[PDB]
Design a binder for this molecule. Structure first.
Ligand SMILES: [Mg+2]
Lengths: 154, 154
């Protein structure tokens, strides 16, 4: 088992003028599900005076669904709050906690790629509808390929 | 350094018919501060279909305040959602993650004492005003004495 084998899906979300919005996700997941966790991922920030001013890894249990959410909170400028979420089954929570250092490493690396792809794609209008999700799926697919080379520290 | 030396304060809270309420805390902390984190501790459950059906440890960053909240969610019957929160400075987050097993151990042990003290004290009226906080302060003070014997795994 690897981090990638327990990563059920991942989501890149940005809070634009209409609130949290899924930009891309991986792999094939019903949009109603994506929208739910995309929204939860960024409303963990409801009462943060300045959003995600520190790139914050937050492990968030989704008790009812038996999921643990690995949520990386960050910002995009040239300011949008944004999140990168990896979701895993709740039973693995203890291994995920032990593995926080490598998770923070890869989440930073992938977040940088997603930031650059967002600024590149939304040059003209930062509020445009997301008519091409594939640059973001490609980046998230790459994430998962790299996660699958990290064996579970357990 | 021990877990107890980085534990800035702790709170035992119960969500009764009027919502989240601090029952006791340790040591001396302005009530407006206690009420803030007491409330946040239990509204992490806003969108949980059945509250804290699984005793859930949740590490929650308070980015703006530079705090990490160690939040144990549990229930009281003879059903109230309840929380036990230990707050630490955000810089220690990485050590806290490594130490999840012993934290879950002691949080379970202390939560059992607080549950028994709550059922004992609110026998007649479960919605009564909290006119005697000291049984709960004593339990939380005991927590902190035990935390101070756990050296930081780092
Ligand atoms: Mg959390």
């Amino acid at each position: 088992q690897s981090l990638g084998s327990i990563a059920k899906f991942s989501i890149f979300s940005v809070a634009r003028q209409a609130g949290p919005e899924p930009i891309g996700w991986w792999e094939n997941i019903d949009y109603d599900i994506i929208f739910k966790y995309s929204t939860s991922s960024l409303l963990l920030l409801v009462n943060e005076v300045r959003g995600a001013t520190h790139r914050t890894l937050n492990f968030h249990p989704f008790i009812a669904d038996q999921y643990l959410g690995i949520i990386f909170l960050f910002q995009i400028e040239n300011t949008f709050d944004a999140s990168l979420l990896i979701m895993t089954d709740y039973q693995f929570r203890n291994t995920i906690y032990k593995m926080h250092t490598v998770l923070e490493k890869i989440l930073n690396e992938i977040s940088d790629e997603l930031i650059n792809a967002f600024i590149s794609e939304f040059k003209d209008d930062s509020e445009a509808p997301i008519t091409n999700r594939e640059p973001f799926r490609i980046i998230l697919q790459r994430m998962h390929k790299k996660l699958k080379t990290i064996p579970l520290n357990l």
